[PDB]
Amino acid sequence: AKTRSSRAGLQFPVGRVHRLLRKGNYAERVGAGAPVYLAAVLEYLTAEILELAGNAARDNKKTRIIPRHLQLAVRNDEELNKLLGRVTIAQGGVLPNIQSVLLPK
């Protein structure tokens, strides 16, 4: 294979992640494993998220992942939710949670 992506057996474009790291003034020089590693970690996470979004889409009987589905995904996962603990998703909405003391007895 020609694509460095394939050499790494990755979906993400390792050539892109390589250009970016240079046109980005993070350091003089960039290693060759760093793009690879990063391009992969990017993939793990988009996968990790898309997984939970799809499930969210499924319960809501839907073919197509819309941001509510990403939002539900993110704030239901303790850990993803913390990675994006200071982030807003356009059209997210919030998690259904109503405080106890506001419920009738």
Partner 1 sequence: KTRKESYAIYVYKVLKQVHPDTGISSKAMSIMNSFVNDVFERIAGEASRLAHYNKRSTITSREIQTAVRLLLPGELAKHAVSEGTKAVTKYTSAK
Partner 2 sequence: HRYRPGTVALREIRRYQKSTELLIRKLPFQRLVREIAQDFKTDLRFQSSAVMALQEASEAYLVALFEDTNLCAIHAKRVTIMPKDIQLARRIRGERA
Partner 3 sequence: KVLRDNIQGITKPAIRRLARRGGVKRISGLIYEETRGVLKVFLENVIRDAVTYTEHAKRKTVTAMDVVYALKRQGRTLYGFGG
By CB under 8 A, residue 29 contacts partner 3: no
Residues that bind DNA (CB under 7 A): 3-5, 13-16, 18-19, 22, 28-33, 57, 62-64, 66, 104
Within 13 Å and on the Cβ side, how many CA atoms surround 16?
8
Q: In terms of Cα–Cα distance, which of 8, 32, 7 is closest to 21?
A: 32
Query: Contact, 49 vs 70, CB < 8 A?
Result: yes
By CB under 5 A, residue 9 contacts Cl ion: no
**Of 83 and 93, which has the nearer Cβ to DNA?**
93
By CB under 8 A, residue 37 contacts its own copies: no
By CB under 8 A, residue 91 contacts partner 3: yes
**Of 92 and 101, which has the nearer Cβ to partner 1?**
92
Number of residues interacting with partner 1: please give it, by CB under 8 A: 62
By CB under 8 A, residue 95 contacts partner 1: no
Token readout for 3 is 């694509």
Q: Judging by beta carbons within 10 Å of its beta carbon (0-12, 13-18, 19+), is residue 34 exposed, middle or buried?
A: middle
